[PDB]
């Protein structure tokens, strides 16, 4: 229960991985036994590598485990991954049949093989990308269509003369450096999650319906793990690029039914539940700022998103960052009075612990 780590972990074959688990730094917890075990079916929760010197037969040459007592963390490295290593695992301390653990899910996907006739582009959610398409020396006076196989329909919703979709409106252009040579290009601003898939580009047509592919991958951001305790404080560092340094930035908290709730804005908003215990700082030359929240309660734990928009709300097509927070609650911070009363003309005296 006080143990925390990355909930889901993805990779491909041949690659490595690095998993970190967190624990309270009390002296029993630093000297006790640490373990990594594979919670299979049929009862047991068989250990794969441990802290005392046990390495299993399947993990020989591939893995190790290092304990850092001053962080209160311990790391597990696993090299040369396969597809039989997909399953549910556990960090832990002590004896397996107790419950001082944390569940981790690991999925390994099959890589690329013998289909490499495309030029892929990867891009962050809410950024720009280009799709180059070599124009040739006869196919100018046709249509420069661009399908996207919704099912197996050729869905032309982009043409290079303005015949566009009301879906993809307001952000698509072309710029001319062609007229005889072998390139033109289209810049796509403010990509969404909806705009993935395979693109069958063309530039004119010589009638064999000859095909060119140029596919893209749009990825949602990886949350950073923060480990704090009761009655403490946290800082986030929101470090988007200098391209949006004149936009109003914000910070929500993810809820169950896909609902950010605004904690702070740059145009002057606040929740009532954070009155008295939140700060927001002026941004630097890089357009990077920090948000401080003190007096951490139990219900503050969850996913947080910082972004940017013209109004200060989570809208689609906006660049985001992420975090995941854990409030420990087996804290060592001493309790204190929260309210101190006084009368007019009198004194007060408050005790402040470090």
């Amino acid at each position: 229960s006080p143990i925390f780590g990355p909930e889901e972990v993805n990779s491909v074959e041949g690659n490595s991985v690095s998993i970190t688990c967190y624990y309270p730094p009390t002296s029993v917890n630093r000297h006790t036994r640490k373990y990594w075990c594979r919670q299979g079916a049929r009862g047991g929760c068989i250990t794969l590598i441990s802290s005392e010197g046990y390495v299993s037969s399947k993990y020989a040459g591939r893995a190790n485990l290092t304990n850092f007592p001053e962080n209160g963390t311990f790391v597990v490295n696993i090299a040369q991954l396969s597809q039989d290593d997909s399953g549910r695992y556990k960090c832990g301390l002590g004896i397996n049949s107790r419950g001082l653990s944390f569940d981790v899910s690991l999925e390994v996907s099959q890589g690329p093989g013998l289909l490499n006739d495309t030029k892929v582009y990867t891009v962050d959610l809410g950024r720009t990308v280009t799709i180059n398409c070599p124009f040739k020396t006869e196919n100018a006076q046709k249509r420069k269509s661009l399908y996207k196989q919704i099912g197996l329909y050729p869905v032309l919703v982009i043409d290079s003369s303005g015949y566009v979709n009301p879906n993809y409106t307001g952000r698509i252009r072309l710029d001319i450096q062609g007229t005889g040579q072998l390139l033109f290009s289209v810049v796509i601003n403010q990509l969404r999650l909806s705009d993935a898939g395979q693109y069958l580009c063309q530039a004119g047509d010589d009638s064999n319906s000859n095909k060119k592919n140029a596919d893209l991958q749009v990825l949602k951001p990886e949350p950073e793990l923060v480990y704090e305790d009761l009655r403490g404080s946290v800082t986030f560092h929101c470090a988007l690029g200098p391209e949006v340094a004149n936009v109003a930035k914000f910070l929500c908290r993810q809820s169950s039914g896909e609902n950010c709730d605004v904690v702070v804005n740059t145009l002057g908003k606040r929740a009532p539940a954070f009155e008295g215990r939140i700060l927001l700082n002026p941004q630097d030359k890089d357009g990077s700022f920090s948000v401080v929240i003190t007096g951490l309660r139990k219900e503050d734990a969850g996913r947080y998103l910082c972004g940017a928009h013209s109004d200060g709300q989570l809208q689609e097509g906006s660049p985001i960052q992420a975090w995941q927070l854990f409030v420990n609650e087996e804290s060592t911070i001493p309790r204190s009075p929260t309210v101190v009363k006084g009368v007019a003309g009198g004194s007060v005296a408050v005790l402040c612990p470090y």
Partner: protein, 132 residues
Amino acid sequence: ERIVLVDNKCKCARITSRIIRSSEDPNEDIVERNIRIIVPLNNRENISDPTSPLRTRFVYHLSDLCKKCDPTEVELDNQIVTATQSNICDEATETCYTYDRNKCYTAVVPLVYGGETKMVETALTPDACYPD
């Protein structure tokens, strides 16, 4: 299984409770109480080594598990007063059935070193007894 009342680690007993707003008769509802006892099958009676054989009898008094005797702070008028919280805590002295992960338990054994003897100290739970 919702709210913890007692979490005792000298006897290793835990009591929770929950208002189950049941489906049928929707203007009345039950109060459930869960108790969990974990019984060690290899501990001694006193926690030293040669005491007496392994404990075979385990007794739990819920009037003692729910007891509360540490002083508290109460704001009455515009004041802070200190009060007690129980009628029966005329007095450690309780017997423990299990160990506790956050406390040392040591012993003393005399061994010989050629001439005299010593008073060598021995850790009974080695994880919790590092000097740190």
